[PDB]
Amino acid sequence: SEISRQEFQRRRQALVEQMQPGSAALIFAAPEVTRSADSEYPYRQNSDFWYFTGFNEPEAVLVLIKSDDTHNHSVLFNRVRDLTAEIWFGRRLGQDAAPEKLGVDRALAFSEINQQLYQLLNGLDVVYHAQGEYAYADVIVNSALEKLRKGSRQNLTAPATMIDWRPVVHEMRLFKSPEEIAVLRRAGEITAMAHTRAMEKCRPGMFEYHLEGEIHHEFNRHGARYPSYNTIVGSGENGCILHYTENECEMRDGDLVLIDAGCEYKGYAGDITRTFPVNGKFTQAQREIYDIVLESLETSLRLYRPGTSILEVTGEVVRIMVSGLVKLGILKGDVDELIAQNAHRPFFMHGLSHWLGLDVHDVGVYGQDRSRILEPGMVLTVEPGLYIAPDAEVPEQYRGIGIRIEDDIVITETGNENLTASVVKKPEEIEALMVAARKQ
Amino acid sequence: SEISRQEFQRRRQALVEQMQPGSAALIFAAPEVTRSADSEYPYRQNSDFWYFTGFNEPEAVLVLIKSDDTHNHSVLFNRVRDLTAEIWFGRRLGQDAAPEKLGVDRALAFSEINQQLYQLLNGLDVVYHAQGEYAYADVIVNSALEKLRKGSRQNLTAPATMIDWRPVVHEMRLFKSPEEIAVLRRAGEITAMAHTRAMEKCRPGMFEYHLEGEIHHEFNRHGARYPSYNTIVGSGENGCILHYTENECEMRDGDLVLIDAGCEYKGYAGDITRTFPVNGKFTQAQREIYDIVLESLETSLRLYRPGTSILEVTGEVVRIMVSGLVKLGILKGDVDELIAQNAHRPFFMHGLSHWLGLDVHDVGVYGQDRSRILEPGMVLTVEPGLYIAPDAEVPEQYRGIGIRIEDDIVITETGNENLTASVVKKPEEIEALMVAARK
């Protein structure tokens, strides 16, 4: 699945609809990023620029101009076609092909932006600009405005009002269209297949990075060349480190391994966590903690639907965790009092859910304590976990256990749809999957 | 292989030996780098900082202080141990463990650097600093020097002399030690195994990115988690684009595929290019161009040794290329006159060789036109290629062909050693490899 030309056009028009008449919106591409010396990281387009264009080049700026309630047009600044530069550093769209390819009215050379941008802004009332996003963009915009302010003798005038478009655009991105959901559905499927493979390939004596290798190979073979975030493969005590990415330890017989990994597919993030035994068999202690995390996830998946909130569902998860931990002797006392003093916090220190989209921790207002009421089209994660430190003062058999189970969901009219249910999470299904692979 | 504790110590002392007495050298870690929003790229340490420490954390500064010809010591600024920050964002070395782990005399918290750096620079004559390398570093150094300059009432004085250590350090990096050659040898072996795998897996109907996938999986399984540069898999007309990295096309029966890929193993880069037929059998036209590129490589591998230069070996390659292109009717005229007017340039527009090490395009002075005399311990690539554009005014059978063959070598006392010869390059050996894999 992919985003259509018509969809990119609908998005631009949805932004223009919200703009004041006599205004321009400026959306800048991400700069290229150095890895070491003259070598650069693989390019990642700015998510907001991507959202409106699907254009994966640096040194580009989309300018949407609204003259009035009926009249508007678009101008793209982008890199010129240069024979030498392209023979070396790959093909460029250029100005001639851009209008048809990207559906813009006019395309100009990025090298002319300082000579041209002020002419587009001249006489407008409002400029929409994400100030502070990129230094290079701020320099360009501020130079244009200073030329206008100082140009009264040349009959130039600057827009006196500057508005940050990020709140408006981020509210747009928070609600996914059917096309976006189709892409996310594919990202969830590719990511699930990778996690299934990792479970099937895992053996004691392999290093954590070997599972990272299997995962990335699986992403790649489905056309998702890059992960959406740095893959976490935390076995044994490494599972208690939330963003463990060193992945440098030999995986030991008797340990769990926690894998948090997600592909980026057409710009959209998958984000799945599975935890499983390195040797294919959960111990009683591992099983006891796993069951609490799994009940929390399964209950959350039943509960999430329009009209509730992350905060509300979190309250139900907290009760499940505290109750579970009291039965194991990890916490001691009255459940309601323990809940009241947030006694689960040492073992579950992060949020249950975040938005998901073009960024793995996606944009959009959560409300105070993530109390915002959920509506259809919102996409989020559900990721309960329990992390018991090696030095925790609890019964000894629980020490050094880190378990998280994370799925990705979309809120629908009546409930939710689980985009990542195709990789198993019940302990018996995990064990059966691993047994079958070890035959083969 | 690996770089030992003792080696890192030897490198630091070799720098200190070149410093003036009453001086300090400041070496800064790379900043973390945003990929998108709050997510960051996998961390890549600054090569110079890595060279002296083997320490893979940001927000760190190595300070080497030379009081006089016999007295010197080291101070590390690095991130403090913080229980919360580490539970979230991974373990940190901290101050207590750093002296023993990294072999430094003293370790201080990076958060204190502005309160402490000026105290270390106070009263010195010279500061060694790579000005302009990182903005955050320049801010820290300039703030320290300003405090000192303005602090005469507090009996503070600034060093009046600032020296860029990069020329000295880059000259050090240009000559590899035996330990570094052992690591580069392993990087070359891992990289060669990945290229062999790609040749064995290649089938028409696969996409270019599938071979990139096979290559990266092979790097990873040997403990090289990241490539040293973005992998190029250019099939058909994409082979004519030197740094083609989109890798987005379906590979077609009848085309060649050019793969330039290299692992990063313990910080050191492999850098290998192989070109081969997608269907396992070179056509006559493909073979005609391939043979010119291969002769260029084989001749270069015979010639490279102490006392010659990249410029000198390039001259021999240019003669091989022009002669070959004249025989095929791609160029027309007298070979010597064609050579004199650089008539090969449309088809071979890059250099034959670059230095290789902690960076794929490694540091070190080349001399004018890469005329520097080679000496033992230098590591470099040898990468002749011919790229005939789809619209080139040449016989049709040669249009749209891009071929490069690249090996990594070390200059020895008498010649060179080839670190990447374990992946095949003779056309009959390539074909035999692919036939065997397809059984």
Next chain:
Amino acid sequence: SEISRQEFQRRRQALVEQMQPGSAALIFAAPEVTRSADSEYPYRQNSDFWYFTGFNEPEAVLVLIKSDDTHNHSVLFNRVRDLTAEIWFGRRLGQDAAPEKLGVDRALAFSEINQQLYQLLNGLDVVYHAQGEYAYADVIVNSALEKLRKGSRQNLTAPATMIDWRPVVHEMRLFKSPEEIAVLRRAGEITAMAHTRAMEKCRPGMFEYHLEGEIHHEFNRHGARYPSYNTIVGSGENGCILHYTENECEMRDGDLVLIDAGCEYKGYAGDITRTFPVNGKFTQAQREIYDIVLESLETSLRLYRPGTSILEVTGEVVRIMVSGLVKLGILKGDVDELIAQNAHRPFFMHGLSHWLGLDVHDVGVYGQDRSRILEPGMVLTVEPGLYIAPDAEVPEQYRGIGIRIEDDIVITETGNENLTASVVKKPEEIEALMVAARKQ
């Protein structure tokens, strides 16, 4: 005369009246300015900050907050009282005395601005800020906004709209109140007295800077310690250089001297130019050029009134100049054709009039080609001049003559009032003044 506490308060309220509800306006003081090494120039407050406060300290920020159409309040950030700093570098108002002295609701220490400003901006819809005016101010404002944008977990939100207040404030400053006119009337009088003194003191053999000395002494004795711009004393060929400020030549018998000088009185600028013979007697040639400039000035003074424009009056002056220059043989041809080709331009290359106020070249929109229709309360200069270069291809006796005569006026209901008419400009009155002084 001076500006009352009540006037500063009226100005602040006039700005607040124009502000959107749920907004804050930020007005920053001028930074201190280095002259050499550790020594600084005498402090000059930012004109807009001065306009709203009459407060002559650096490191101060006025914040006007409008909650709604009826509720508003003011906060001042200013330097704290520090015993040591004040014993050295003079007295400071401080926080305790500021509310009563400056009529602000609340005063805070400037050293706390980064800890406090974001708290004032939190939850507002609009911030009014003159972006690009001062680097130090931009840093403060941008830091506050980034704290708010990034502080959603602490229930902080940034105003998404930023508006430049300069257009609004500069339109306010363009129209002078009766109190301001009274101050400008005094500035004009002090400046006129200085020009009269210079004429009376002038002798051949003095240096140009000696007249600058007399002028500055006269400003000072009336309580105007500083000039409003760098004094110009251009004798002989120096009179042809519009902003000649070297004032380094010995004044010669037979030359004219052009003096452009103005005091700054309570922040307001005088701006007068007189040209006169060093030896007290105009030659025929000097008189011939002087008469053209004087007719231009006198005609302009008759013409300026509500409903005309600088552009319109300039057209009448151009006709006077071209006609005059044709009769002298300086220009040759038909007057209307010469006017049509702007043939006066080599001899009169600057504008006839500029706004005057807290800045000598005062703020306010002029309109295209200074075509804006004049209204009561506007204050402007009238400064025709003719400058004939030493190498000009004209009759030889005119070469090297520079003459300008400049008065300051206020537009009134029926015409204008000349604020600088108390220094003479008719050639016979100039000569009589000088004769009388030489007795002284």
Next chain:
Amino acid sequence: SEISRQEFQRRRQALVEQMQPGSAALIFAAPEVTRSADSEYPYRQNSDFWYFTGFNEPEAVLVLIKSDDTHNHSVLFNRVRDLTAEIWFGRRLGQDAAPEKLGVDRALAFSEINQQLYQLLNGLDVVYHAQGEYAYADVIVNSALEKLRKGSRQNLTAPATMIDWRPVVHEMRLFKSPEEIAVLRRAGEITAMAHTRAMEKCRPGMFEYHLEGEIHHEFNRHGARYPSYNTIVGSGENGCILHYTENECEMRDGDLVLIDAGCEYKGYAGDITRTFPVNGKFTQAQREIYDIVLESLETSLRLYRPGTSILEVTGEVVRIMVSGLVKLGILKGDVDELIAQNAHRPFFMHGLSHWLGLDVHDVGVYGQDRSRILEPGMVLTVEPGLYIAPDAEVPEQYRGIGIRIEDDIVITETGNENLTASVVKKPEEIEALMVAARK
């Protein structure tokens, strides 16, 4: 007096003599400075740039290039002659006239500096640059060095060593030549005449700023158009504020007025303070404090000579002050114990002396606690004072009294010469001066 062409040349050569071979020194003009909106303050050239050129334009850079021990030359970047710009904003020297006028070998347009500076720095070993002095200069120098560092393919190389010339130049400025002493002598005379005039014109009912007016008029009539610092006229309780410059109060019969004012003559600063009674007659209480300050000055003027230091002379002044204050009952106790606890500090909180020259607080190393040994050619102020706050817990008749007496001296082979002795300071001479003027 004036500084000659030959002197500017001698100064440049004295800098070049201290430079390493294969180096360039870069000296930048001061930027223009905004007063309000489009209006600028009167231009004040950078003192170091002035010292080497006597050139009073912005957008200028002096480049001194030393090829070797015998070969050196100079390049000036300055504003081009532009007919329109000059008709408006005054005459410019330009490129054609600069070599002869300023004694430079070559002059280039400032607008070309980014196209030309890197070409001058190319291949040098050392650049002398005052980093951090001006932002515009740092941008120009950093851009040049970046072009060179990145320009190896164009056969460009950057100097790896950057040295701050300010320590060397400021040590030069610390020792005045005979020509400079002649200019400072004239500055002292002009300044003294202004102070005499202020004393003769002073009347009760005048405002403090009226005396500032008389002073500036006197500076101006002798060709010193600008003061070297903001004039202080502190009458009554304003005399206790060290840098009181508001000068806004009516001067009252019964008060003292403290005037600290100095002209700037050919770039050089006068710096004189005199305190005197507004009504022409010192009261007993005023005289009691005045006499302590005057004894301090007179003793300092006897003591200052080669081989002593500001610190050493300060010790004698402190004894005079404490002894005097004890006699008046302002301090109580044993003199030696009071001295040991610095009991004078509440009343005398600044230094006795600072260097004087192109800046009023001139450049040059003072040593710890101003302990540097004085040598011939150093120019400094001598400015004891006593400031008793209005709320000080001392006898009432001394509260709110601020007295300072300041002279400018040059250290000679055997002692010192007083450049400002032509304005009176003995109380009976002050009174006689004022009585005579009031007839």
